Design a protein around this ligand. Structure first.
Ligand SMILES: [Zn+2]
Ligand SMILES: [Zn+2]
Lengths: 307, 307
């Protein structure tokens, strides 16, 4: 996975802040200045982004959970779009101190959110006074704005992808403390020190932000599915055996002896065994019950069967 | 997209029916017979499946809708799994004559399904007698079993993918009449004539059926997203220009003159214009209102702006 330099140039990825606003720590990523404005060196952005994408692909491929964080105007709606498009998670309105470091508390706040969700729907709020119903409605607003993108995360994320390292410094510091790797777009006015995988680039243009998140969402989908990887395993070696050769070889795989197999499905009075024939074999449960009339085997168990 | 011959052999794709059950029309796809059973020639299955996958990829890439059809025991639950995994549609319980050819009627039956959905939830059924409520409950059962996988299809499909051509002959004939292309697994006991893209193979093993649907769902996801295609466009040509060359070239793209731009977002009193700077420009709506105080422009419109 990569984005080309020409694509980044068109999106404005190389536009830094005015030089008077810079953080000197971004010097290695700066190409120069034109008209009192810093130009970001895409010669560095491209390999550093590829490096970031490769590791996010690896994390996603072990069922890793990715938290997209971006709450500034330019990032907010796109962060949600990206996260949804690859079945991950997000914070896009505002960060509450402790979302990560006090995660056991957040977990309870999530159940409280779901209870308030139910209450607002099943008429509980209508049986309250206006003053009370408003209290619960504002609480539900706070919880949904802040936790709505993570309510099904189910534990700490395995990585953070962040738009604007300075704007999101609180979250980045929590991740640091927990040893959660941080991938971030770092603009010329920002401190890169807390960022594990820095991506030098413009964090102020919707089109630039969209370019980054798109490449991220794609590589995360590829990590989960293994679509393109499993496919490009057919070119790694010779596969030109004839069917005839392969079929005759498979006939000699028969030794010796009645057959052996594996349960794949147990619906009452129907036990299903894959013994590698044309069809799986559906067996009456009775052959698999003990003296008390209970099922002895489980889906995935190994068994025997009579040809 | 492809499945290897070794993968098909392991899944049992080559196991045909007993020869006494064959349809002579399947002769070109048959390798031979062992123990009074027909062996399917995978030398033919592999290129014919690749051919089918390539055209399904093309159909999906123009936002085509794919209807997965499989109602026999071995196909039923996997057909649903596959369809869901690539955001398409399915029929997996039983085919009602006219689902395709009388589609304008099906459309009304879909709204009737949604109304019954609401009624069963909002307590309408509880206000009925038992005899009446049972009538509506059975109607809801019929509609959900048959239309549940297509209720958001929104029109005729652009292709059918079918498990077992003989078992699903009714649907295949409706598609024929409507000119909708049929992709189907055709076993040695079946008639291939109605099938546009026949895939000679075992249609009785869950593991074989799973192998086919998996490859289909992947190629459909790839058609929609263009993940792997857009990525493998970076290898088609030289991309070794230095950033310096590219940046200096982009500086000469400035001619002449105040700037020109494109609206991207209109939220009351905030009009957003992309003029290719570091940030999009947010302009007060007032500059864009006519004498009556109405908005003159729309999202996507072209405008002008003062630097
Ligand atoms: Zn910035
Ligand atoms: Zn069959």
């Amino acid at each position: 996975a990569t984005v080309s330099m020409r694509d980044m140039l068109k999106a404005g990825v190389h536009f830094g802040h005015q030089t008077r606003y810079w953080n000197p720590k971004m010097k290695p990523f700066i190409f120069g200045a034109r008209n009192k404005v810093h130009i970001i060196n895409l010669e560095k952005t491209v390999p550093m982004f590829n490096e970031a994408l490769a590791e996010l692909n690896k994390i996603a491929s072990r069922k890793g959970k990715i938290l997209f964080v971006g709450t500034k105007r330019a990032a907010s709606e796109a962060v949600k779009d990206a996260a949804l498009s690859c079945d991950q998670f997000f914070v896009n309105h505002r960060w509450l101190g402790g979302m990560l470091t006090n995660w056991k508390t957040v977990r309870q706040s999530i159940k409280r959110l779901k209870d308030l969700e139910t209450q607002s729907q099943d008429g509980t709020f209508d049986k309250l006074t206006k003053k009370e119903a408003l209290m619960r409605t504002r609480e539900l607003e706070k919880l949904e704005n802040s936790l709505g993108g993570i309510k099904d995360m189910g534990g700490l994320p395995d990585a953070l992808f962040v738009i604007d390292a300075d704007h999101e410094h609180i979250a980045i510091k929590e991740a640091n403390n927990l040893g959660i790797p941080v991938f971030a777009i770092v603009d010329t006015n920002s401190d890169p020190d807390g960022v594990d995988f820095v991506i030098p680039g413009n964090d102020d243009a919707i089109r630039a932000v969209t370019l980054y998140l798109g490449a991220v969402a794609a590589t995360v989908r590829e990590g989960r599915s293994q679509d393109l990887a499993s496919q490009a395993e057919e070119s790694l070696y010779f596969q030109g055996e004839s069917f005839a050769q392969l079929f005759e070889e498979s006939l000699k795989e028969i030794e010796t002896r009645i057959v052996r197999g594996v349960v794949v499905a147990i619906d009452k009075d129907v036990v299903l065994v894959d013994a590698g024939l044309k069809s799986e074999s559906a067996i009456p449960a009775e052959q698999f019950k003990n003296a008390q009339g209970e099922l002895e085997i489980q889906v995935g168990d190994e068994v025997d069967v009579a040809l």
